[PDB]
Amino acid sequence: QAPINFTSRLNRRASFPKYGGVDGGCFDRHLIFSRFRPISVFREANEDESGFTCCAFSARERFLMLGTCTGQLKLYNVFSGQEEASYNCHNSAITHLEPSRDGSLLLTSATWSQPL
Amino acid sequence: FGESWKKHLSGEFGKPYFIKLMGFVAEERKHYTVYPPPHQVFTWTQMCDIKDVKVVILGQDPYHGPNQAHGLCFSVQRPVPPPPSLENIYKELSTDIEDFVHPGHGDLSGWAKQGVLLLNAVLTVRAHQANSHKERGWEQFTDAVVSWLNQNSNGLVFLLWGSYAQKKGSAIDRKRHHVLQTAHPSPLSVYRGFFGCRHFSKTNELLQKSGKKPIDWKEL
Amino acid sequence: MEQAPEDQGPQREPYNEWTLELLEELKSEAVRHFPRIWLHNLGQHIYETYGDTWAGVEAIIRILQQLLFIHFRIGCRHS
Structure with missing residues (x-):
């Protein structure tokens, strides 16, 4: 199994195939869909309050x-x-x-x- | 202002609320913008006379936008696109007048020379604001006008549509006059009754119970 | 390189009439799902605050379509 840390997977994928170990892409999806950040908010500035x-x-x-x-x-x-x-x-x-x-x-x- | 209107409206001044009206609304003209100026309040007492008044139609609130209204109730300036309830009373006029012509505008300078008392109850409100003021004296100044016409002038009719007009002039007698009320001319008036009633014949038709100066709706 | 398409759809040029062609229709479905108590009372509440100025006329078609959407979204079959 690929290691739980991400840097330990990153060193391991340099000398091993695609992801690093057995169930390696799963850990790569835990760190990458557990964080979100709002970029832009789209209002409807016609009658001063949105109706979407x-x-x-x-x-x-x-x-x-x-x-x-x-x-x-x-x-x-x-x-x-x-x-x-x-x-x-x-x-x-x-x-x-x-x-x-x-x-x-x-x-x-x-x-x-x-x-x- | 029309002098013959005040043949006996000299009993409109000497009350404790009149100086409350013409000073504070003038004070509201000295700070804010109440929308209709003094040279548009006096249009109904100028264009028609008091000798030919035959229809009494009240008006609740003026039009708070700039360059819209000109004093008469349910009325607006001619370059203004026409208001929807005045556009809504046009719908019954087609279904009863077979010769239905179209006004194309919002100035009511065509029916005012007929015998309709297009009176707003509160004549002035502020600009961009609907019902900001308190009872500063516009109400009872008209209440002393409406029920005064129950004495001297004659041949009226009450299409007091909407509960705001029902409180003011309901109890005037039905031997001398005729009172018929229904739902509001606005389409925002969920409880129906206005939506097809043929009241607009009974300006031409209830005067056949009197026999006074006639009416044509089509002066537009 | 996306070209937004030409708006040759159903236009609504008589906005004073298309509203009147549909403000009855907004009343023609809210009575089919709701009692007329709130319908006249909210219509009175805007008419005391927006009046006959088109700022309640579109605004009731705001509030009626804002409720009739969510009342067909929360999970009531009619109400």
């Missing part, structure tokens, strides 16, 4: 398609932090929102609107 419901990223990871309470999805650059293109999508709200991997399609489902 659903969140997802785009198919190219530049924009992140948030979703308001009013039923419109608003694009935001992950680098800029700027409203780029709102879209009058639904009447009720946005419940679910996922894109496709090729970047050609987009599924959005609403709360009570007559097309759901």
Whole structure:
């Protein structure tokens, strides 16, 4: 088994295959998903308080398609932090929102609107 | 200001709340911005006379935004996009007037020469603020006007829609006049009753119970 | 190199009418899930504080859609 310390795995992977020992990549995922840090907060500075419901990223990871309470999805650059293109999508709200991997399609489902 | 209106409104001054009104609201004009100026308070007592008043429609609160209102109740300036409840009373006007023409604006300078008393209850409120003031004297100054018209002028009607208008002028007699009330003209008024009632005939129709100077809604 | 698409979707140019085409609809579902006690009382509470100024007209479509989303999210079948 790979050692519990990370520097002891780092010296061992220099003369052993990919991770360092048996169950070596598991320890590499303990140290790397047990810490998080907030980078940016995206408000909705139109009526002074945010109304977001659903969140997802785009198919190219530049924009992140948030979703308001009013039923419109608003694009935001992950680098800029700027409203780029709102879209009058639904009447009720946005419940679910996922894109496709090729970047050609987009599924959005609403709360009570007559097309759901 | 119209002098013939104050033929007998000289009993509006000598009360303990009148100097509370025209000084402190002037003091509010000397510190803050109450929105309608003195040259827009006196429009209803200038444009129409007191000799032809036939409809009494009250008004709760003025319009706190700058360059919007001009004194009459439910009324706004002509370059302002029209208010929604005044846009909401237009919906019944199509369903009852077959010759429905469209105003296209928000100035009510067309119905004011008919016989409608488009009176706001509190005539002035502050800029950008709805109901900041206390009872500084705008209420009972109008309460001494509304129930005074129960004596001298005649041929009125009360479409006192909304509970704010129900408290002020309910108990005026039904032999001399006619009082019909329903839900509010706003679409924010969940308990319905306004949404299709055909009250707007009964300006043209309840005057057939009197026989006075006629009305056309379509002066727009 | 991401090109955000052209907003050729359903536009809402008569905003004074599209609100009126839907503010009844916001009332046409909240009565189908909630008693009218809170509906008139919250509508009165904004009308005493925003009035007939469109700042309660969109704001009730804020508060109604903010509750009807979460009331269909907490786990009540109707309420």
